[PDB]
């Protein structure tokens, strides 16, 4: 048995051939364990991966066409799929699954990734019978996070830059979603940064008013986006099918927005783009290195997040790294 990130004790199954995903983008965690057979055990998912990550989906589809046949689940009807195990993030469904004697498990990469990333992966290894893959990944993640924290962990406060991250930036009106105590806040923290939104928000996630961003006037501005290139909505295009030019053209439109454009971060050339889905992915070690390299360019000269992404895809994944995951002005 094992305790999940909700604190509930779950009986490790004797048989796992059929996995259910309550958020499609839990795929990122599972992709790390399934090796060269990523979709062999997936019997169903919520459509956020297929729909809110069309780009990655499409790369996988090219190599595994059968991905299209996995049903989208958006409570009696999910049982027909016959899951050995169901996975959730932090319902009638959860009851319906436990009433049917189906092991349910909650993980976390969104609310508190500092705390819950590696524990979540450890849990998954056990309950998916992929402990070796999970422990391999922990070792990887740890060594790559260590490259940052070695340097950033004892940096005095007056050395540290102030940082603001506008999550899924775009559209003066939504402005500005951000992370506080949690989420990418944790990566700032760790990268030797100083999240301005931290003491404005109770939660990991939330919305701050543009006025406060301009008034605070942070050293560094980061915008998260995962917008597909053909998606011409407000936001940073980034992902598996984005070019560097598209990332920059689109990052610029975001920095050119009203208010934003007057920021010292914009004028001082300290504006960056980061792939949004690291806000809820165990791949977020890539974001940690990039933030630290943006924050202390000279100290992280020898560091290359692309080498790390290549190293990850080759060790763990069944597709090739393509596209643009980060960008500078």
Phi, then psi, of 109 in degrees rounded to 5 = -130, 0
Q: Which residues sit opposite 225 in a β-bridge?
A: 275
Quick one: residue 22, left, alpha or beta (phi over 0 = left, psi -120 to 50 = alpha)? alpha
CA distances from 300 to 161, 190, 205, 289, 296 (A): 15, 14, 28, 8, 6
24 near 45, Cβ under 8 Å?
yes
In Å, what resolution does this model reach? 2.1
Tell me which fold the domain 156-328 belongs to.
Rossmann fold (3.40.50)
Of 221, 249, 251, 257, nearest in space to 236 by CA: 251
HSE-CB for 96 with a 13 A CA cutoff: 11
β-pairing, 177-179 with 205-207?
Answer: antiparallel
C-alpha radius of gyration, the chain, whole number: 20
Domain 2-129 and domain 156-328, same fold? Reply is yes
Residue with tokens 């099918």: 241
122 near 4, Cβ under 8 Å?
no
End-to-end CA distance of the chain: 49
Instruction: Please write down the HEC assignment for all residues of the chain.
Output: CEECCCCCEECCCCCCCCEEECCHHHHHHHHCCCCCCCCCCEEEECCHHHHCCHHHHHHHHHHCHHHHHCCECCCCCCHHHCCCEEEEECCHHHHHHHHCCCCEEEECCCCCHHHHHHHHHHHHHHHCCCHHHHHHHHHHHHHHHHHHHHHHCCCCHHHCCEEEEECCCCCCCCCCEEECCCCCHHHHHHCCCEEHHHHHCCCCEEECCHHHHHHHCCCEEEEEECECCCCCCCCCECECCCCHHHHHHHHHHHHHCCCHHHCHHHHHCCEEEEEHHHHHCHHHHHHHHHHHHHHCCCCCCCCCHHHHHHHHHHHHCCCCCCCECEEEC
Distance between CA atoms of 325 and 33, rounded to whole angstroms? 22
Distance between CA atoms of 305 and 286, rounded to whole angstroms? 6
Q: Does the domain spanning 2-129 belong to CATH 3.40.50.9100?
A: no
Of 225, 251, 223, 235, nearest in space to 164 by CA: 223
Of 66, 27, 60, nearest in space to 46 by CA: 27
Of 255, 295, 291, nearest in space to 274 by CA: 291
18 near 10, Cβ under 8 Å?
no
Of 318, 288, 5, 319, nearest in space to 141 by CA: 288
66 near 38, Cβ under 8 Å?
no
Both tokens of residue 314?
């080759």
Q: Where are the domains of the chain?
A: 2-129, 156-328
274 near 242, Cβ under 8 Å?
no
Using omega within 30 degrees of 0 as the cis cutoff, is the peptide bond preceding 134 cis? no
Both tokens of residue 327?
């960008």
Phi, then psi, of 199 in degrees rounded to 5 = -95, 20
63 near 318, Cβ under 8 Å?
yes
């Amino acid at each position: 048995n094992i305790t999940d990130m909700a604190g509930r004790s779950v009986v490790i199954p004797a048989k796992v051939e059929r996995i259910l995903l309550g958020e499609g983008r839990l795929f990122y965690a599972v992709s790390l364990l399934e090796g060269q057979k990523p979709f062999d055990r997936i019997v169903g998912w919520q459509g956020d991966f297929r729909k809110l990550d069309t780009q990655t989906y499409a790369v996988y589809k090219a190599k595994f066409p059968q991905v299209d046949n996995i049903p989208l689940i958006g409570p009696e009807k999910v049982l027909t799929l016959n899951p050995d195990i169901a996975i959730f993030g932090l319902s009638e469904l959860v009851k319906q699954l436990e009433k049917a004697g189906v092991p349910v498990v909650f993980v976390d990469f969104r609310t508190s990734p500092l705390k819950n990333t590696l524990p979540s992966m450890r849990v998954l290894g056990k309950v998916l019978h992929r402990e070796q893959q999970a422990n391999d990944y922990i070792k990887f993640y740890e060594d790559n996070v260590r490259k940052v924290t070695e340097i950033t962990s004892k940096i005095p406060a007056d050395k540290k830059p102030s940082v603001f991250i506008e999550l899924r930036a775009g559209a003066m009106e939504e402005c500005c979603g951000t992370a506080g105590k949690g989420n990418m806040g944790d990566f700032i923290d760790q990268a030797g940064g100083n999240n301005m939104a931290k003491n404005l928000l109770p939660g990991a996630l939330g919305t701050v008013n543009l006025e406060k961003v301009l008034s605070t006037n942070p050293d560094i501005y980061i915008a998260s986006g995962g917008k597909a290139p053909d998606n011409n909505a407000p936001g940073v295009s980034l992902g598996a099918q984005v070019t560097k030019e598209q990332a920059q053209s689109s990052l610029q439109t975001i920095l050119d927005r009203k208010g934003i454009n007057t920021l010292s971060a914009v004028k001082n050339g300290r504006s960056y783009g980061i792939w949004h889905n690291f806000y809820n992915s165990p791949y977020n070690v890539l974001a940690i290195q990039s933030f630290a390299k943006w924050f202390y360019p000279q100290q992280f000269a020898d560091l290359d997040p692309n080498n790390t992404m290549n190293s990850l895809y080759s060790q763990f994944l069944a597709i090739e790294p393509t596209g643009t995951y980060w960008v500078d002005s």
